[PDB]
Write a protein that binds this ligand. Structure first.
Ligand SMILES: [Zn+2]
Ligand SMILES: [Zn+2]
Lengths: 453, 453
């Protein structure tokens, strides 16, 4: 067993919202044995000094696009609206691929860098949505991301994505960038069979993740609804980005939500990215259907889209998680940092009603238990006996956090660095003293840097 | 001389916005001798390896309230409007003071911690506006902040503040903080005598800094205007916070700007904090007067105030700098991190006009040359021969910055940490390898922590 002893603060996000001061966490293999004061070192082979740290459940990034790690801080994409951005991302990936610079071997190393950054930011589970499948067959991009995740020991969900609707039939995505529906469906069946670990504490899971209503055929949504039921997997897509409702109205005469409902996606199998601009009248329907929503504050601001109605979702009892999206519209993978953006940016929408503003604890819950719920993981996101030993800890004793009265608020509101001190995934210590203990950091940086087009 | 050799990127903010790749900076005493490729090491006693770093002028925080370092992450102040915030801050400061827990000795150590954090975040100059003068005579609070700054070697401007308008004599300030105008003027003259270093590369400067139009007598503004011209010092106050216009209309029957103009503050000696909600028709007047504005995105969002019209200011040719304000409304001193907040949060105000969005380079200029201009420092904020050797460098070769195409944009848009690698102030190396060279970090944390009420 591993004992983390004397943590200054432990935030459990359990059903009573318990927190503890000067307390311990005991781990046995993949699971937490106990969380409490003065735990027995009875059968402990290693004790870790937690004094001066705050411990949370590992952060869970419920929406990534890992391959975009190769597209950070491109000047031509710094200040662009969505149409220009998407064109720029699609054309660069296709161009680099055509030139032999962007195959699965490159994506493997880009994924490795972004996932290692994720671990260093206290993120223990990442859900990636990968849509890039150029050419005549679906190449081993998903396999590559899974290989990187497995090598690092980070918990991983792969939501296989696509664009199946071309401009010729109402999609805002060129035919060149379009895949046949049957090819997508066939590929997903194989991925589930090869990789999906449905058991508690499973380290790799597959989800079905169309890019969205403006990008994919209704037939794909229906195929995936059937596949999800048959194989007991989850469903993910983008939802209510600003131009979406215009597209669905024009093509189908209905809202994006009504479209999802018609095609089998109004269910508790589903988590939805962004959800920036739904009609208010649909919010109770999201709640009744049991869909979950991932708040992605950074891209919502970066694209000029604005503020998702997160308070309204919480009021309605809808599950709200958190994510970063990909590094071409963030442009980092720093989930903890992005929580600060949300804590501050929502406030001016309700200048005279601060009770509506999202609190630090609400945001930390979104990034842990909320994201776990988005991914369908009752085994994650909570520090309590029987849950996965996925733990992230930050030091509280730096000069940049002097004067902090509440350490949980301090995690969001103070600091020069979001680097986690100690990170455990599946009971394995992966980061200590802000440095990877198993991954070869310097080698990974060098190798991936050499491969960036 | 000191040579920093082989910097990967140098951003000068000189008159032609020059940048350099694989270049050097040569320093002699307090000044930059040269910036360019393959500089001679003929007169050099120390060479520092700059490979893998980006170098900027040191960041300049043009608006702080250092004493608020002791008031971070207080649950009762997490989500509050300004009225509640001000009451909570004033009540705590006065209460702690009355109980002997908040004298200049405590403020010295709080300042030391926040200023060390500042250095670690690449900030080489701070302008503090100390807002706490309990009782009749003003204690050595300013002296305490200056002592901390001088001990650390950070360049420092102290804007002497006040609340000269009593809440009784029709005002908005607790009478316990109300000093006679002549007492304030006298303290300022003494501070100038004792501390002001008007020569180029001066390390301590005094500014004259009323809290604001709702807080100070017109007589103080006029006295300060006279002093500014005669001593060649600068003038600083808060400007166009929400509700200020109503307060000014009630007290004086004119706008906050009209008030400043009437009392001598419509001049190029002035920099103004926040400037969130001016009447648009006054903006050309600000420009004609030559006043400068410090953008403070974090408190503007934290208080629910919203987005200052920064693009409008830039369009009008108004000098724009940047600051963090105090740690009771931030709640950190991380200027670089706050730039990212501004980069993103301004965008949804102009969803269809990305050319209006603030660029990374515009923001980095605000935090360097713009802030230098706010403070009246033509010797700072630019990496060029003859300017002060105030330099901040960040590493570009971490795993969290893999895939970055433009390092300047990357500094704003990526990363787990805003910690600077190498920091030089007045030609003195103060941070290397992210660690203080001279300051005892652990002792400072322990000592200051012990004194937080
Ligand atoms: Zn996405
Ligand atoms: Zn202020």
């Amino acid at each position: 067993m591993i004992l983390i002893r004397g943590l200054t603060r432990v935030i459990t996000f359990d059903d009573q919202e318990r927190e503890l001061e000067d307390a311990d966490i005991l781990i046995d293999g993949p699971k937490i044995v106990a969380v409490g004061k003065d735990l027995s070192d009875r059968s402990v082979s290693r004790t870790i000094d937690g004094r001066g740290m705050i411990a949370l459940p590992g952060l869970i990034n419920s929406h990534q696009h890992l391959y975009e790690g190769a597209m950070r801080a491109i000047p031509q994409l710094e200040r662009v609206t969505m149409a220009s951005w998407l064109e720029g991302v699609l054309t660069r990936s296709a161009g680099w691929w055509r030139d032999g610079k962007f195959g699965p071997d490159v994506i493997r190393e880009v994924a490795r860098a972004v996932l290692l950054e994720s671990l260093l930011g206290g993120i223990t589970t990442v859900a990636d949505q990968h849509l890039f499948f150029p050419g005549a067959t679906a190449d081993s991009y998903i396999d590559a991301t899974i290989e990187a995740a497995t090598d690092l020991g980070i918990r991983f969900h792969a939501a296989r994505s696509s664009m199946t609707l071309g401009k010729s039939e109402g999609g805002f995505c060129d035919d060149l960038f379009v895949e046949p529906v049957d090819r997508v469906v066939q590929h997903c069946l194989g991925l589930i069979d090869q990789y999906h670990e449905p058991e508690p504490f499973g380290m790799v899971r597959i989800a079905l993740g169309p890019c969205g209503v403006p990008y994919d055929k209704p037939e794909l949504f229906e195929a995936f609804a059937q596949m999800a039921a048959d194989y007991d997997v989850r469903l993910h897509t983008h939802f209510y980005e600003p131009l979406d409702a215009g597209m669905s109205d024009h093509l189908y005469g209905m809202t994006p939500w009504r479209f999802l409902e018609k095609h089998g996606w109004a269910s508790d199998r589903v988590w939805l990215a962004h959800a920036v601009v739904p009609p208010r009248e649909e919010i109770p329907e999201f709640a009744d259907a049991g869909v979950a929503i991932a708040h992605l504050i950074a891209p919502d601001l970066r694209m000029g889209w604005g503020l998702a109605p997160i308070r309204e979702y919480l009021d309605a009892g809808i599950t709200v998680g958190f994510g970063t999206t990909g590094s071409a519209s963030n442009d980092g993978g720093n989930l903890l940092g992005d929580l600060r953006l949300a804590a501050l940016a929502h406030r001016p929408a309700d200048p005279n009603e601060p009770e509506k503003w999202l609190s630090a604890r609400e945001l930390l819950r979104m990034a842990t238990r909320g994201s776990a719920e988005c991914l369908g993981r009752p085994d994650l996101g909570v520090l309590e006996e029987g849950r996965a030993a996925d733990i992230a800890c930050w030091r509280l004793d730096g000069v940049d956090r002097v004067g902090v009265h509440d350490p949980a608020i301090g995690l969001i509101m103070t600091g020069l660095s979001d680097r986690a001190s100690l990170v455990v995934v599946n009971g394995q210590v992966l980061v200590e003293n802000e440095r990877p203990v198993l991954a070869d950091l310097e080698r990974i940086v060098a190798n991936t840097t050499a491969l960036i087009p």
